[PDB]
Amino acid sequence: KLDVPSLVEICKQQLIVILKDMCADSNSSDEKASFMYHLNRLRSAVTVVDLHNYIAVFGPCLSYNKLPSTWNISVCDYLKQQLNILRAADS
Amino acid sequence: QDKLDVPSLVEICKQQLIVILKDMCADSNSSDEKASFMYHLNRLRSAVTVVDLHNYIAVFGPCLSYNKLPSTWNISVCDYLKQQLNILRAADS
Protein backbone atom coordinates (compact mmCIF):
# COMPACT_ATOMS: atom_id res chain seq x y z
CA LYS A 1 0.00 0.00 0.00
CA LEU A 2 2.66 2.50 1.10
CA ASP A 3 4.81 2.78 -2.01
CA VAL A 4 8.47 3.70 -1.52
CA PRO A 5 9.41 7.33 -2.34
CA SER A 6 12.61 6.45 -4.21
CA LEU A 7 10.89 3.95 -6.51
CA VAL A 8 8.26 6.56 -7.39
CA GLU A 9 10.99 9.08 -8.15
CA ILE A 10 13.12 6.76 -10.33
CA CYS A 11 10.04 5.68 -12.27
CA LYS A 12 8.89 9.28 -12.69
CA GLN A 13 12.30 10.40 -13.95
CA GLN A 14 12.54 7.49 -16.40
CA LEU A 15 9.08 8.37 -17.72
CA ILE A 16 10.16 12.00 -18.17
CA VAL A 17 13.28 10.82 -20.05
CA ILE A 18 11.19 8.62 -22.34
CA LEU A 19 8.67 11.40 -22.98
CA LYS A 20 11.45 13.84 -23.88
CA ASP A 21 12.99 11.24 -26.20
CA MET A 22 9.61 10.84 -27.91
CA CYS A 23 8.70 14.52 -28.28
CA ALA A 24 12.22 15.67 -29.17
CA ASP A 25 11.62 15.16 -32.91
CA SER A 26 8.41 17.18 -33.04
CA ASN A 27 7.84 20.90 -33.72
CA SER A 28 4.11 21.57 -34.09
CA SER A 29 2.60 24.06 -31.66
CA ASP A 30 -0.17 21.68 -30.55
CA GLU A 31 2.24 18.81 -29.92
CA LYS A 32 4.34 21.21 -27.84
CA ALA A 33 1.25 21.79 -25.69
CA SER A 34 0.60 18.05 -25.44
CA PHE A 35 4.22 17.37 -24.45
CA MET A 36 4.01 20.14 -21.83
CA TYR A 37 0.76 18.63 -20.55
CA HIS A 38 2.23 15.16 -20.12
CA LEU A 39 5.47 16.55 -18.65
CA ASN A 40 3.59 18.58 -16.03
CA ARG A 41 1.38 15.55 -15.34
CA LEU A 42 4.51 13.48 -14.67
CA ARG A 43 6.11 16.23 -12.57
CA SER A 44 3.03 16.61 -10.37
CA ALA A 45 2.73 12.86 -9.72
CA VAL A 46 3.19 11.75 -6.12
CA THR A 47 2.09 8.08 -5.98
CA VAL A 48 2.30 5.05 -8.26
CA VAL A 49 -1.44 5.49 -8.83
CA ASP A 50 -0.74 8.77 -10.63
CA LEU A 51 1.87 7.12 -12.87
CA HIS A 52 -0.15 3.92 -13.46
CA ASN A 53 -1.31 4.79 -16.97
CA TYR A 54 2.11 6.00 -18.12
CA ILE A 55 3.71 2.82 -16.76
CA ALA A 56 1.08 0.86 -18.70
CA VAL A 57 1.95 2.71 -21.91
CA PHE A 58 5.75 2.55 -21.50
CA GLY A 59 6.07 -0.88 -19.86
CA PRO A 60 8.40 -2.54 -22.38
CA CYS A 61 10.56 0.60 -22.35
CA LEU A 62 11.04 0.69 -18.56
CA SER A 63 11.67 -3.02 -18.76
CA TYR A 64 14.61 -3.63 -21.12
CA ASN A 65 15.53 0.02 -20.34
CA LYS A 66 15.14 1.25 -23.92
CA LEU A 67 14.29 4.60 -25.47
CA PRO A 68 11.55 4.63 -28.14
CA SER A 69 13.40 6.66 -30.79
CA THR A 70 16.45 4.36 -30.63
CA TRP A 71 14.71 0.99 -30.14
CA ASN A 72 14.59 -0.59 -33.61
CA ILE A 73 11.53 -2.82 -33.18
CA SER A 74 8.24 -2.92 -35.05
CA VAL A 75 4.89 -1.87 -33.62
CA CYS A 76 3.52 -5.43 -33.71
CA ASP A 77 6.54 -6.70 -31.78
CA TYR A 78 5.97 -3.95 -29.21
CA LEU A 79 2.36 -5.05 -28.69
CA LYS A 80 3.60 -8.63 -28.34
CA GLN A 81 6.06 -7.44 -25.68
CA GLN A 82 3.14 -5.81 -23.88
CA LEU A 83 1.10 -9.02 -24.14
CA ASN A 84 4.00 -10.87 -22.52
CA ILE A 85 4.04 -8.30 -19.70
CA LEU A 86 0.28 -8.93 -19.40
CA ARG A 87 0.84 -12.68 -19.11
CA ALA A 88 3.62 -12.22 -16.53
CA ALA A 89 1.18 -10.55 -14.14
CA ASP A 90 -1.55 -12.70 -12.54
CA SER A 91 1.06 -15.26 -11.46
CA GLN B 1 -27.33 3.17 -13.37
CA ASP B 2 -23.80 2.01 -14.28
CA LYS B 3 -24.95 -1.59 -14.65
CA LEU B 4 -26.64 -2.19 -18.02
CA ASP B 5 -23.67 -0.53 -19.74
CA VAL B 6 -21.04 -3.04 -18.62
CA PRO B 7 -22.29 -6.27 -20.32
CA SER B 8 -22.85 -4.65 -23.72
CA LEU B 9 -19.57 -2.72 -23.64
CA VAL B 10 -17.54 -5.73 -22.49
CA GLU B 11 -19.09 -7.82 -25.26
CA ILE B 12 -18.35 -5.30 -28.03
CA CYS B 13 -14.83 -4.58 -26.78
CA LYS B 14 -14.21 -8.32 -26.46
CA GLN B 15 -15.17 -8.91 -30.10
CA GLN B 16 -12.76 -6.19 -31.22
CA LEU B 17 -10.02 -7.66 -29.02
CA ILE B 18 -10.48 -11.12 -30.53
CA VAL B 19 -10.08 -9.56 -33.97
CA ILE B 20 -6.84 -7.84 -32.93
CA LEU B 21 -5.42 -10.88 -31.10
CA LYS B 22 -6.16 -13.14 -34.06
CA ASP B 23 -4.40 -10.64 -36.31
CA MET B 24 -1.32 -10.69 -34.10
CA CYS B 25 -0.80 -14.29 -32.98
CA ALA B 26 -2.92 -16.66 -35.10
CA ASP B 27 -0.85 -16.49 -38.30
CA SER B 28 2.45 -17.85 -36.92
CA ASN B 29 3.02 -21.38 -35.63
CA SER B 30 5.62 -21.73 -32.88
CA SER B 31 4.73 -23.90 -29.89
CA ASP B 32 5.04 -21.50 -26.95
CA GLU B 33 3.30 -18.76 -28.94
CA LYS B 34 0.42 -21.14 -29.63
CA ALA B 35 0.36 -21.52 -25.85
CA SER B 36 0.38 -17.74 -25.32
CA PHE B 37 -2.38 -17.31 -27.92
CA MET B 38 -4.49 -19.94 -26.13
CA TYR B 39 -3.75 -18.20 -22.82
CA HIS B 40 -4.95 -14.80 -24.02
CA LEU B 41 -8.02 -16.36 -25.66
CA ASN B 42 -9.03 -18.05 -22.41
CA ARG B 43 -8.31 -14.78 -20.59
CA LEU B 44 -10.66 -12.88 -22.92
CA ARG B 45 -13.29 -15.63 -22.64
CA SER B 46 -13.26 -15.39 -18.84
CA ALA B 47 -13.52 -11.58 -18.78
CA VAL B 48 -16.84 -10.37 -17.38
CA THR B 49 -16.41 -6.68 -16.53
CA VAL B 50 -14.59 -3.66 -17.91
CA VAL B 51 -11.91 -3.93 -15.23
CA ASP B 52 -10.95 -7.47 -16.30
CA LEU B 53 -9.88 -6.30 -19.78
CA HIS B 54 -8.83 -2.79 -18.73
CA ASN B 55 -5.26 -3.85 -19.47
CA TYR B 56 -6.10 -5.05 -22.98
CA ILE B 57 -7.89 -1.76 -23.63
CA ALA B 58 -4.74 0.00 -22.42
CA VAL B 59 -2.49 -1.97 -24.78
CA PHE B 60 -4.71 -1.73 -27.86
CA GLY B 61 -6.41 1.67 -27.39
CA PRO B 62 -5.33 3.22 -30.70
CA CYS B 63 -6.13 -0.03 -32.54
CA LEU B 64 -9.74 -0.20 -31.35
CA SER B 65 -10.35 3.56 -31.46
CA TYR B 66 -9.25 3.85 -35.10
CA ASN B 67 -10.30 0.39 -36.39
CA LYS B 68 -6.70 -0.61 -37.11
CA LEU B 69 -4.93 -3.97 -37.04
CA PRO B 70 -1.32 -4.18 -35.79
CA SER B 71 0.01 -6.20 -38.73
CA THR B 72 -1.45 -3.76 -41.29
CA TRP B 73 -1.22 -0.30 -39.69
CA ASN B 74 2.42 0.44 -40.65
CA ILE B 75 3.35 3.24 -38.27
CA SER B 76 6.37 3.58 -36.03
CA VAL B 77 6.44 2.76 -32.33
CA CYS B 78 6.85 6.44 -31.42
CA ASP B 79 3.74 7.50 -33.34
CA TYR B 80 1.73 4.70 -31.72
CA LEU B 81 2.95 5.85 -28.29
CA LYS B 82 1.91 9.41 -29.14
CA GLN B 83 -1.52 8.03 -30.06
CA GLN B 84 -1.67 6.36 -26.64
CA LEU B 85 -0.64 9.66 -25.04
CA ASN B 86 -3.53 11.35 -26.85
CA ILE B 87 -5.99 8.73 -25.56
CA LEU B 88 -4.46 9.36 -22.13
CA ARG B 89 -4.98 13.12 -22.31
CA ALA B 90 -8.53 12.68 -23.63
CA ALA B 91 -9.35 10.49 -20.62
CA ASP B 92 -8.88 13.35 -18.14
CA SER B 93 -10.22 16.30 -20.16
Side-chain angles (χ1 to χ4, degrees), chain A residues 19 22 26 34 37-38 41 52-54 58 68-69 73-76 78-80 82-83 86-87 90, chain B residues 21 24 32 36 39-40 43 54-56 59-60 70 75 77-78 80-82 84-85 88-89 92:
Chain A
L19 183 63
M22 272 171 71
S26 208
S34 81
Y37 168 77
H38 290 296
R41 184 84 170 303
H52 165 38
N53 293 335
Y54 292 83
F58 299 127
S69 73
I73 197 134
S74 74
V75 50
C76 215
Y78 188 94
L79 285 319
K80 299 191 206 212
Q82 305 219 249
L83 282 177
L86 267 287
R87 180 182 190 178
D90 317 310
Chain B
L21 192 57
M24 276 166 77
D32 65 353
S36 83
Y39 168 74
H40 290 297
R43 181 82 169 286
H54 169 292
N55 314 76
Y56 290 107
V59 194
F60 298 123
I75 64 182
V77 285
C78 294
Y80 189 91
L81 293 183
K82 298 182 184 187
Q84 306 217 246
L85 285 182
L88 199 92
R89 181 179 188 176
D92 309 316

Side-chain angles (χ1 to χ4, degrees), chain A residues 3-69:
Chain A
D3 49 9
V4 156
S6 63
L7 296 214
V8 173
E9 197 56 42
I10 298 84
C11 184
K12 174 165 151 185
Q13 284 307 305
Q14 288 167 310
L15 301 204
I16 296 178
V17 166
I18 293 184
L19 183 63
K20 287 183 177 189
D21 186 65
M22 272 171 71
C23 301
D25 51 347
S26 208
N27 65 349
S28 316
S29 270
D30 62 291
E31 68 75 21
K32 299 191 224 320
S34 81
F35 159 87
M36 282 301 313
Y37 168 77
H38 290 296
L39 172 45
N40 270 51
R41 184 84 170 303
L42 287 188
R43 285 205 217 277
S44 316
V46 75
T47 181
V48 171
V49 167
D50 304 312
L51 299 181
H52 165 38
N53 293 335
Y54 292 83
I55 303 139
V57 159
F58 299 127
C61 291
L62 297 178
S63 162
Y64 294 1
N65 221 289
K66 299 294 293 186
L67 284 320
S69 73

